[PDB]
Amino acid sequence: SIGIAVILVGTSDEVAIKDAHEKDDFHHLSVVPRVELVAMNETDPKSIITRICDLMSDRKIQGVVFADDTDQEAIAQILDFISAQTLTPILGIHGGSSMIMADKDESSMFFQFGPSIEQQASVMLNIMEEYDWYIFSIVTTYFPGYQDFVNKIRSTIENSFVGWELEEVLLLDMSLDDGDSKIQNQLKKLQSPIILLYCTKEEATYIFEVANSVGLTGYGYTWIVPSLVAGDTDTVPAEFPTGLISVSYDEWDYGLPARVRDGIAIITTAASDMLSEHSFIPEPKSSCYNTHEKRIYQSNMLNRYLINVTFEGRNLSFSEDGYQMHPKLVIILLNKERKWERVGKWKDKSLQMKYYVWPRDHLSIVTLEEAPFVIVESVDPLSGTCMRNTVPCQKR
């Protein structure tokens, strides 16, 4: 008896998604997942509000599911604003709706399928743990999320028994006018094999170009950047060094039809427990007229249920801010040409990297365990890595 508006913007596989609606079986929850599927290609703010508002009073849909393909971030803003006033859950499955906003409205019920900067920062260290990388030289800019990126890295460094060496936290300001030298001299302090860059994709080229003027972008180093720096993996600004590593959301395996089924399941699973535990059905005034007096009825009891939702053994739980607790994060690496290729995947703090050794003097050495000459032992249960006076050695 609950209707969800699966809104799609632009060209997308609507037919394939509609197939999953029939296969969506939730008889255990005993809630009928009505789907108000609609298709449209005008992502302008007027159309998206008037489409939701018109469908609000059409059949009193409790929740809204949104999908998109544009790279603009303004859609996630309006959906958060819409969900705040209407008090109706909105899921940012695809496109600009999945672009995570650090701060949302207090009353907003907008949840997004994406990782946080802190989640991507911790994944950056996991790939540095696998290959025994213990140098950081974090380079950031004045982007709003730069504090949470550094704080998570610093918090993880000082709360772990692994030996992490942070060299510098070089910070650059892009607001200077004719200040190319001011930024350039700041980067001259780099003396490390790894730089954890955090900046806009446009600002990344400027930093890379300044490093290109220095020339020490990458020859035996490695630069690790979040999905924000990579942006659209289809286009490369040709200044990104070969070997760039990015922690991007799973846009390849996690296709849009699969997301809609999970997105629909999230709303009904949370809603099913709301009508059974609290014995209250969410039926607010769906009209948009005089929204000031429409705030008397509160649907915030459903927020505690949308936060904790499980489906098919997968913890599809959203954080308080709105992002996923357990996202399907993959790692993309620049190829020999200018193409991004998946190297590994991350799920539940587990890194299933497909590379046993990182490719790039370096020479392989054989070894046999015998006598005090070579003694092999398992990894340290306490530190988690090779102990003092010990080096790693693989085995087939």
Added chain:
Amino acid sequence: VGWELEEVLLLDMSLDDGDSKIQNQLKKLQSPIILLYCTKEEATYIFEVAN
């Protein structure tokens, strides 16, 4: 006397658009002291690339 010679560079100034080529050789430089030997006009070009 213990003398530590890191490397001896050798740059060619006859390459058109050879800024990258000179830059590439100087990229592998890490030494407290550099004993430069070139013309005065070529020194500015090398210093500019060093800049």
Added chain:
Amino acid sequence: FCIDLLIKLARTMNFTYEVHLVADGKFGTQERVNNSNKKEWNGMMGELL
């Protein structure tokens, strides 16, 4: 020895004290609790910080 030295410190530097023994009974060693994977001091160092 330490209390006799502490009483001397209090008299000269003019401060009052309330001596309490350490609850854990350990001197101090940085260890990570498996409950939260957070490095914390146990003993007199945990109390002081």
Added chain:
Amino acid sequence: KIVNIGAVLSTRKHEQMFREAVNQANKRIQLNATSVTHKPNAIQMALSVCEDLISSQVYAILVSHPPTPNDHFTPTPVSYTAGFYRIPVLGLTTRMSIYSDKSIHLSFLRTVPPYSHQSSVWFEMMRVYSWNHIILLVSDDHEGRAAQKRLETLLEERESKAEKVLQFDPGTKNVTALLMEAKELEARVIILSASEDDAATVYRAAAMLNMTGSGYVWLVGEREISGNALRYAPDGILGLQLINGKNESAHISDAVGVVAQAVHELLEKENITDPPRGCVGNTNIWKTGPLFKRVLMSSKYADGVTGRVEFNEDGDRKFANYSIMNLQNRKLVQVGIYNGTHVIPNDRKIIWPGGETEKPRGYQMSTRLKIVTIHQEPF
């Protein structure tokens, strides 16, 4: 060429005089006025904003403070609809710190600094009276965190840290436990970054805990010395007050003038595309948007009713003078003027909490100590 810089302002009487401000701006390549009243409905506000763009064809939108005391949901619809097309939005009479990031509000500017920039004043006030150990009582909201977050960054340059950064959840009535933790500290200077409503709860519990007596200092921003907070404010509070924060008339002339110089620069530039001329037909980012905002952020009016109007890298107003107020006999008296880089106190004397005529030290060392020992045989 005809360029529209029309605004969205409440108090329709102000709309008529805003258009008059446009008339005098062109004398100092054509301007038009399409002022629109603020729609009380939140959803209909966003629809009305983009509806006008079809006929107005605006280049920048000015948003002011409606009579509603919400102060948060009122300028958000304008900054979102105009952010898609990168149309700059001027925050005439909004002082929330959320609009100061380039992520959520991409195309937004403010003619007044937010409430979080008072901490720059408190850094100078601390140095004027030589205060080093302070207590922060920020709230858990973004406004409280932003006021906190930029305070230690200033303290980092001094290479000093706040004694404690106690936080309280917004809309909390039981706070005595939090204030008890502040009483046990050695720092007597209390810096409060709460809201208008939350100040009364802290002030009420402070009096019940004898926290408003002699030897205590209360550094407080504009939000906590107005309205309900002024009723329960203990005497001697070193509050702050913006010169024309509540004056919409002064800033309208500043905003119209500030855009006008950028408009002339924008006209004298290449790739100056015309505005959306609609809201549903177009679905792409207005390429003139980011170019217009870049020069606009650098377009500082030489002078104005509120003084030289500049813009920080985040769109916040730069170098705005603050008036330091003290509560003497339940009256907000002027004690000094913030020069914008330094604090310049007046000749009037300052009455401190507890009726103290002289400046309290602001730090009381604890004679009593707690000592931990572990049983060792000889020691």
